[PDB]
Chain length 109, copies 8
């Protein structure tokens, strides 16, 4: 199930940090529906990237995302104090989304 991220990363004020998020062909490699959430300690998460590289309203362009193959990336440039937080990526996950019946043999007499 889970998408692999490094547990720690760092950068300096004004600089850039990049964090990665590895999954499989069922999610990150399969679809363009990767998101990144930013969460301060004991606060609710905020979406900062959806659909791989698209920013919600009021999220600045210094946050950006991309992917290649099964690895997605978030990059934060012009790093600021408010950017210290946990960052979780998420993705659409595939499933055949189908359940099959056991079958009924109909005989005609």
């Amino acid at each position: 199930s889970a998408l692999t991220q490094p547990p720690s990363a760092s950068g300096s004020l004004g600089q850039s940090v990049t964090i990665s998020c590895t999954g499989t062909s069922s999610d990150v490699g399969g679809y363009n529906y990767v998101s990144w959430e930013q969460q301060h300690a004991g606060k609710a998460p905020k979406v900062i990237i959806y659909e791989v590289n698209k920013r919600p309203s009021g999220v600045p362009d210094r946050f950006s995302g991309s992917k290649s193959g099964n690895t997605a990336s978030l990059t934060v440039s012009g790093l600021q104090a408010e950017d210290e937080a946990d960052y979780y990526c998420s993705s659409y996950e595939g499933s055949d989304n189908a359940v099959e019946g056991t079958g009924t043999k109909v005989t005609v007499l």
Copy 2:
């Protein structure tokens, strides 16, 4: 993982047979995407009902389908020889369709 059907059913030529297909709120009770396939021995299945009660082109009106709650039904009236076969129901199955990352603590130095 499966929709419950009786394994046997019968009817006579010219008569009706009805066969049931029980699932849950995740599939039959949750959506209007139940299908029925008809399959002759060592032959490929053919869809006879989709979206609960809709017939593909070239499937006659004596085949019909419905559902209530978690149980869907196929009815075959004016039963004919070609109707002796196995009959499998299927349905869309729900799933949260989402996978979560392990998280990265970003520190700003």
Copy 3:
């Protein structure tokens, strides 16, 4: 195919009504029935779409409706230019699926 009577008639000034029977997959399933009017060896012209809506420049004496699996066109104040073939059409639903003939795999 949607069932229509092949012939119908009316007198000048009068009305004619023609029917169009389908199934729950089309006429009984959706509100997307159209009627086209076509003169011999001429291109069809849409006269009704979405069951009862007229395109621009089509007069109100053409009108349409449906009930259950049967849709209807009515032409009132019948005129000479109204002699033509009239075809109904409808959105058709689809399972959107095609099945293969199968292969028996043997393990030797």
Copy 4:
């Protein structure tokens, strides 16, 4: 109407078998929604591949699928005894979504 598959195929224990599934631009050549089902005699089919090359949970990686143009392929490697079965491919089919009336000649008297 139907997707073309060879009716027989074979392989030896431990080896590979590959089976093909030819359609048109309306299905296999048009979309990435080709599935393969595996079915044992008088048993219900099980989905083994969906969306061309994606495996449901609990289906091993030795089953794999692909396509090129109008032909899709299932490959089974490390062939085992339980793999003797019928295998059916299926695909999303596009549709003009339109049905035409037979016409009425209106005469004005």
Copy 5:
């Protein structure tokens, strides 16, 4: 405004004929929803191509379609007797599909 077609075309039994259908960026050049209907004299039309190059069930592959820019084409090869008919192309036509209100000046006291 109508789509331009030559009023006549011809071919010999066994040979090919190709017929063109010119529109604008609002229809043929704007979308992939061009159709071709075949119609015998005083008979109802039958769809033979939809969505530019896709064939309905039971329509053979010797009918084919394509487009480039604002011109779409139907090609019939292996010409047969039953292929003598009128052939009409059609397309989705764009429109902003929006109607505007005249506006209300709201004053607050």
Copy 6:
């Protein structure tokens, strides 16, 4: 082809104003896609209602919309200074969205 609105309306601070928007079965009476935009003099419009009665983020619940038959309504309660503006309704408009070719008579041999 315009939706009818009264050109003027008024209310006092703290009070309510309601403004109407009449169309036809082709738009307001035909679909649930009516919008209302608010526009200050020589400023760009802002959407305040879409899909008849749904508010975008950051638009308060004192703006509300509804419709009955061919008439849609916007209501502003707890009227405030910033609410003095022009208000335009808009709607999805239907059209058969289809264009027909002139036809080609194909002769064989």
Copy 7:
């Protein structure tokens, strides 16, 4: 903007707790796509309810969810966040340009 939840709630071992989640017709009142996530401190969230009242595999039945109007309701010491599908006008407007001629 955000769905309203009480910031604290309390229950005793063996007992029940219920927590609420108020939104609008654009989300909780508009659709059946409300979720609840459970999150331990500095750990990743886990979905415990989706589509209002449906439990993922391996989540026990003692967790349950429901909604009425705009209000949805739902180691166990943790933070619990609800979320929902949000509808959208799906449109953005330009600031405008006054065009002058000559």
Copy 8:
């Protein structure tokens, strides 16, 4: 959150003016659904371009639109007196379609 346009632009009678409209990958760079409205002082807006470069009926070809990357453009050539007006661009905006709760800390006694 808004699309950037210059507030003023000018041209001479008979000449051309071009005005730009910069957004992001969520709208102008993401989709082909950019529109331009023309609005005279205290009059209702009129759509002059939709779907990037398509003109509604009765709008002449001297109005034209295009885009490259995140910038869309309207060009008016053969400039006339009636063309003095405000001009607003708009675009489909993508959306994560998700709203997050503020969170509840549950404590157990």
